[PDB]
Amino acid sequence: SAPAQEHPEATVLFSDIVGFTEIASRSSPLEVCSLLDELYQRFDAAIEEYPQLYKVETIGDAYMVVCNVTVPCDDHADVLLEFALRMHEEASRVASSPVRIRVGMHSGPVVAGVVGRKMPRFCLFGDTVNTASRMESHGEAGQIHISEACYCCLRSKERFEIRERGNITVKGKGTMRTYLLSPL
Amino acid sequence: SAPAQEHPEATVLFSDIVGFTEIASRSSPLEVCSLLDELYQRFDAAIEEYPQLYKVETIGDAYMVVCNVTVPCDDHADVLLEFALRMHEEASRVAEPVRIRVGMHSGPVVAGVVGRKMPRFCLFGDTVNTASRMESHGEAGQIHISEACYCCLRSKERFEIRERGNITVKGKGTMRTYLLSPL
């Protein structure tokens, strides 16, 4: 199995259910798990249309997606970002007791490779991955929180319409600029 | 595959490298990654002696182990606490030396498979989230365990567990916790 490689510029997304602990508040844990799995399967079937993208369902419930690590792209930020929008509408296709997500993206260097022996897994590693994770957990319900590194990697700023700025700290650095994007 | 199941009592352990940012900043990402995989292979080698245990190296870098979800194991907190002392040992033979922060908690865990073309064994719930918080809220070079996990421990007397006390834990409110130092 090939060694770990460092992709100089890829775009990583995280997504998470809004009000999950509250939804699980009034449901069985097996009820909420199959609610999680249902939403996962809608993402996996919408991601049929986005081949450049790689996704892993993560411990903690976050859905992760990556672009330009599987296949090269350059266009990655843009393709990933449109998929973010698809995620949002596919989130409302699976109601509960309807479902909203929070999405974060970030662009940067990403190390990828295999860990484990009997039980191997593809691994996505580094500061880019970690920051994209705070992007999502510091982002806004129903919206798409994207970093400055990611905004700039867009090859087609002009058809997305990103006006709202924000910030994020995250504790690992100072304060970075971010952009919000509603999907309405 | 069999559907998801709720296991009414299991123990979950998360481990993290202490000051990873200090290590990464002052060297390369492909190298630090090798540091990480070095550690994992040592964990992965020690854990073959602990067949009750199932491990998962997680997307954020945390090494995660669970007991009583795969093979029935009634002293699941005991076995896993013991493996946590082992992890601290395996960590001190990686380079100076690497230190880890370990956290543990016990409770119900849902387990099942998610995904199709690439299925994943999934461990899900409040117990897993809390165990993770036991790690983030713990202490470098030590093992930090919840009261629930102390309770499930059958052989309280085999470990030098000290009561830490009441700390507040993100999302959880007040929890009573315990520490155990290796060495």
Author numbering:
A (entry chain A): 467 to 563, 567 to 653
B (entry chain B): 467 to 561, 566 to 653
Share the article's original sentences.
The three C-terminal residues of each monomer are disordered, as are residues 564–566 in monomer A and residues 562–565 in monomer B. The final model of the guanylate cyclase dimer includes residues 467–563 and 567–653 for monomer A and residues 467–561 and 566–653 for monomer B. The model also includes 8 phosphate ions and 99 solvent molecules, and was refined to 2.55 Å resolution. During refinement, we observed unexplained peaks in electron density maps around five of the fourteen cysteine residues in the dimer (Cys 499 and Cys 592 of both monomers, and Cys 621 of monomer B). We wondered whether the apparent modification of the cysteine sidechains might be due to the addition of dimethylarsenic groups via reaction of the cysteine thiol group with the sodium cacodylate [sodium dimethylarsenate, (CH3)2AsO2Na] buffer and dithiothreitol reductant present during crystallization. We will focus on one active site, and refer to each domain as monomer A or B. In the C. reinhardtii guanylate cyclase described here, the catalytic residues are the metal-binding residues Asp 482(A) and Asp 527(A) located in the β2–β3 loop and in strand β1b, respectively, the ribose-orienting residue Asn 599(B) and the transition-state-stabilizing residue Arg 603(B), both located in helixα4, and the triphosphate-positioning residues Arg 571(A) in strandβ4a and Lys 640(B) in the β7–β8 loop. In our structure, the corresponding residues are Glu 523(B) and Cys 592(B), which are situated close to the locations of their adenylate cyclase counterparts. For Cys 592(B), the dimethylarsenic modification of the thiol side chain prevents potential hydrogen bonding interaction with the exocyclic carbonyl group of a substrate GTP molecule. The modification also results in distortion of the β2–β3 loop that contains the metal-binding residue Asp 527(A) and the base-recognition residue Glu 523(A), causing it to adopt a conformation incompatible with binding a metal-nucleotide complex. Comparison of our guanylate cyclase catalytic domain structure to structures of the mammalian adenylate cyclase suggests that the guanylate cyclase catalytic domain is in an inactive conformation.
Here, we report the structure of the catalytic domain of a soluble guanylate cyclase (CYG12) from the unicellular green algae Chlamydomonas reinhardtii, which shares 40 to 50% identity with the soluble and membrane-bound guanylate cyclase catalytic domains. The 991-residue full-length CYG12 protein contains each of the domains present in well-characterized soluble guanylate cyclases as well as an additional C-terminal domain of unknown function, and has the full complement of residues necessary to function as a homodimer. Each guanylate cyclase domain contains a central seven-stranded β sheet surrounded by several α helices. The two monomers in the wreath-like dimer are related by a twofold axis, and a central cleft, formed by the dimer interface, contains the two symmetric active sites.
